[PDB]
């Protein structure tokens, strides 16, 4: 209870299985509420739509007793392309804020 919120990051080379070793951990937890917020269900959205979808998927996780959420392929959520560089700022800010916001008491 000193730490209600935790996080972890899976890293490696490309083409190595970092989305089938992150679903098998979530599946074998037997938590009540489990979700997956991937980048293939929001093809073509602008920045604000992505922010709203992320906010909703996180809000629905604040109304249970203990939950797990998977954000796979970060570098595609905030569009990255080595030339430039170029990317979205609003999504990065939303992420950097949402990883430090403790949920209501006892959850």
């Amino acid at each position: 209870d000193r730490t209600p919120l935790v996080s972890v990051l899976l890293e490696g080379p490309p083409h190595s299985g970092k989305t089938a070793l992150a679903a098998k951990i979530a599946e074998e937890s037997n938590f009540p509420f489990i979700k997956i917020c991937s980048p293939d269900k929001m093809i073509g959205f602008s920045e604000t739509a992505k922010c709203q979808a992320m906010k909703k998927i996180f809000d629905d996780a604040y109304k249970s007793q203990l939950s797990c959420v998977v954000v796979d392929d970060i570098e595609r959520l905030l569009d990255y392309v080595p030339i430039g560089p170029r990317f979205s700022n609003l999504v990065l800010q939303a992420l950097l804020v949402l990883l430090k916001k403790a949920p209501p008491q006892g959850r």
């Binding site: 490309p14 083409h15 392309v81 080595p82 030339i83």
Partner: protein, 102 residues
């Protein structure tokens, strides 16, 4: 099932955007390099024949050429508008001004 075939003309730029990991293989489409291949293409396209062919060979066998195949359906059809005496010369001149970087 599914199958996607994409065609591009600039591989390096695509390689820079990290868009060459998504594709699962790659094929390479070359250009006419050896003179014999150019002669075969002319023979099959149904154009200059008889002694004309011969003279072309005499001037092209001892050298290398570099020309695309959509660009050789225009030179033939751009050197046919002259009188029936200078067609060969105009074709050779156009190829020389085009066949750069052998």
């Amino acid at each position: 099932k599914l199958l996607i075939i994409g065609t591009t003309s600039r591989k390096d730029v695509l390689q820079e955007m990290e868009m060459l990991n998504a594709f699962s293989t790659t094929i390479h489409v070359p250009n006419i390099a050896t003179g014999e291949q150019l002669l075969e293409a002319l023979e099959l396209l149904g154009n200059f024949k008889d002694k004309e062919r011969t003279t072309i060979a005499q001037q092209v066998k001892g050298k290398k050429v570099w020309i695309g195949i959509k660009k050789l359906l225009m030179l033939i059809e751009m050197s046919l508008q002259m009188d029936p005496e200078y067609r060969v010369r105009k074709f050779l001149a156009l190829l020389r001004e085009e066949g750069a970087s052998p």
